[PDB]
Amino acid sequence: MLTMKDIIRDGHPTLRQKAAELELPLTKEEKETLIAMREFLVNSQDEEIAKRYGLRSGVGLAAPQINISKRMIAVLIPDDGSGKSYDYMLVNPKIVSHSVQEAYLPTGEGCLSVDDNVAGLVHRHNRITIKAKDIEGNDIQLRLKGYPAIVFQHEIDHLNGVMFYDHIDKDHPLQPHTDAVEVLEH
Numbered sequence: 001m002l003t004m005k006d007i008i009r010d011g012h013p014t015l016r017q018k019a020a021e022l023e024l025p026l027t028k029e030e031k032e033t034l035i036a037m038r039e040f041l042v043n044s045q046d047e048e049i050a051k052r053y054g055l056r057s058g059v060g061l062a063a064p065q066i067n068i069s070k071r072m073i074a075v076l077i078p079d080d081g082s083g084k085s086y087d088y089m090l091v092n093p094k095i096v097s098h099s100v101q102e103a104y105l106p107t108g109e110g111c112l113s114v115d116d117n118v119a120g121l122v123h124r125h126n127r128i129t130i131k132a133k134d135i136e137g138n139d140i141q142l143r144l145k146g147y148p149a150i151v152f153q154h155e156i157d158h159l160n161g162v163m164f165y166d167h168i169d170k171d172h173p174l175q176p177h178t179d180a181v182e183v184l185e186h
């Protein structure tokens with residue numbers, strides 16, 4: 001069972017490296033790792049379990065965050081009320097296309113590897129199309145918008161050694177870009 005002790009903190013060199021592409025099929029160890037990454041999110045979102053193991057609630061996790069420099073991510077965004085939910089374990093995810101229009105969460109973003117909050121808007125693409133493989137090597141192509149698009153971009157960034165605060169404007173951190181879409185926290 002993965003817990004906060006497995007999540008490396010900001011400053012660790014692995015978080016700034018470029019994660020390595022995965023060869024398909026994945027080995028048994030890599031599959032178990034990806035499943036455990038997803039299980040971590042599940043547990044983090046369970047009030048009782050998260051309390052018992054002092055887990056910080058999260059909706060996404062990238063292999064580099066547990067010191068594994070491989071291009072694998074897990075996203076677990078619960079139903080927001082629209083009936084839409086996102087439960088994906090992706091291998092070699094890549095954004096193949098995206099909108100020019102940007103989007104951002106009004107209160108900024110948080111990271112499991114970053115202990116203290118960092119104020120500032122993180123502008124990302126409002127719409128993206130991702131191609132990736134699933135845990136069994138099959139093909140997956142997602143068309144995402146708004147909140148989920150932001151979460152997947154946050155995770156993919158980890159695979160390229162990019163941290164959310166890298167996007168924050170030094171001078172005007174809370175100034176939304178022209179025509180950027182404000183995404184309600186959901």
Ligand SMILES: CCCCC[C@H](CC(=O)NO)C(=O)N[C@H](C(=O)N1CCC[C@H]1CO)C(C)C
Pocket residue numbers: 056057058059060061062065105109110111112113150151154155158
């Ligand atoms: C904008 C991108 C969001 C997805 C990623 C992050 C987790 C992370 O560090 N991934 O690499 C997350 O879940 N962050 C948390 C988060 O913002 N959450 C988790 C559940 C609901 C929501 C609001 O608190 C925080 C509090 C650590």
Ligand SMILES: [Zn+2]
Pocket residue numbers: 110111112113154158
């Ligand atoms: Zn993060």
